[PDB]
Subunit: 207 residues, 3 copies
């Protein structure tokens, strides 16, 4: 628990955390410490579990990222971090292309190779994973996850906590409900309700 002055605290110490750490460092940020439910990751010390958050705040650390893949859990831990007095930073790799008219929330991960086009809105705690494409006028709800190499054409809306697997695609104007999962490679050609799983080319709901 001895730490430097000023860096970012990470909740989570798994594979997703490794990628987030590297995005932060590529921007010139310092990663101070990890809290993990199993109480180092790429040279960052694991200092305890989430009970260590008050201690970290008291010692002057005030900036945090939630590096947890599970969308519902990430959302819950973001709220906890904010309650403890932390501000949620963004982890945006410098190679990502984020249009100047994009609206970004807080606690957002944007991985290497991403492109996000004009007038898209990205909710708090979203993940836009490696190589993903978000075209113009999209709306991404809080804590959703666009997996690696996924792509949204224009005017797509993605509900809170929805998850699109590696290489999923969505055609223009479609709306996907909250808590829905699109399997890897699924090609979504019609609106999806909340709380379903859809797979295939074209994607079809699986009961």
């Amino acid at each position: 628990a001895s730490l430097a002055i000023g860096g970012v605290v990470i909740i989570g110490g798994g594979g997703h955390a490794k990628v987030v750490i590297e995005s932060l460092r590529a921007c010139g940020e310092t990663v101070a410490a990890i809290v993990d439910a199993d109480p180092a990751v790429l040279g960052v010390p694991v200092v305890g579990d989430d009970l260590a958050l008050p201690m970290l705040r008291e010692q002057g650390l005030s900036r945090l990222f939630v590096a947890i893949g599970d969308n519902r859990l990430r959302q819950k831990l973001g709220r906890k971090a904010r309650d403890h007095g932390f501000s949620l930073v963004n982890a945006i790799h410098p190679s990502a292309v984020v249009s100047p008219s994009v609206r970004l929330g807080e606690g957002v991960a944007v991985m290497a190779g991403v492109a996000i086009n004009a007038d898209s809105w990205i909710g708090d705690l979203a993940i836009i994973n490696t190589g993903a494409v978000v075209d113009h006028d999209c709306r991404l709800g809080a804590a959703c996850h666009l997996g690696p190499a996924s792509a949204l054409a224009g005017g797509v809306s993605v509900g809170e906590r929805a998850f699109l697997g590696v290489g999923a695609r969505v055609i223009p104007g479609v709306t996907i409900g909250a808590d829905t999962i699109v399997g890897a490679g699924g090609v979504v050609v019609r609106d999806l309700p909340d709380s379903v799983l859809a797979i295939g080319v074209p994607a079809k709901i699986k009961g």
Copy 2:
């Protein structure tokens, strides 16, 4: 209709125009005005419909981009713009990787995150949309459209006005006819004639 000296005139004021405007600005270009069939877009004034083109030319504007998604219409409006004395510029996002041996036409859109490899030829008025990949020795006909996150392997030929939906893929050496549509996610494994629709993995013509 009062405008600055020197910028680019845009035909079209929709979603595609927004993305094109941002590519142009990312390169340091100034966008002077829009003409739209409904007579501002990201701060660019809409000054009239296409009947305003002579007026614009007379006031010294001579550079133009056709930001219209529909391929046949785009092609027609490009010809009209040239007849009115405009030169068609290219709108190439600075993040796109365009090989030094690529041959580019005029009025071409190349969005963020694109890669185009050696000895590919890109016809006038083509769109190479966000994140798309064009491998070596490809031939893209005038006014075709490679949609977001689409990919052509080596030696692929795409006919005039053809359209490949989001995430379409084409294997090496295939030829796709003029006016053909490949649905989102379609994986083209054999030559396609002119004026067909093909969908699926592998892509199959739908009557």
Copy 3:
């Protein structure tokens, strides 16, 4: 056979070589000569077939790249080049994003637009082709080939000489055997043994 002092020798003079040459030049390297079984490519002289390798070495050239698409042949020619006293360079386009914790072998091609994330290991003579994504903690065996716009999620292992076609996708934690082929667009959702062909969404072994 008169050449400059210091550049890279290329085995192979086909389409793949063109792309490799351009990656090398984008990095500031000089390409000295090609050896090809048919005894210029983008301005690089073809000086003979592989029997010219001793001659090249004797004249002071010591750096080489094997620009051959076929994985088994590439692997064989890499061994031959090393036996003749050449060091195998890497051909990594400057636009590729290679994480600082990635382990790279020798003779590796990494094309434009690629992203490779944390703690991935890339075997000698691998090809990571245009726009491909390799997420965290992946293991790519010697002489494998990830085709254009392909994507591996986290923790994927790819065997020696395996080949993933354009736009193939692999979900987290999957292992693909040596010498296996995944067709274009295939979405791999379960481990694959050695020496099979798998196609489709989801990918299925074809006898």
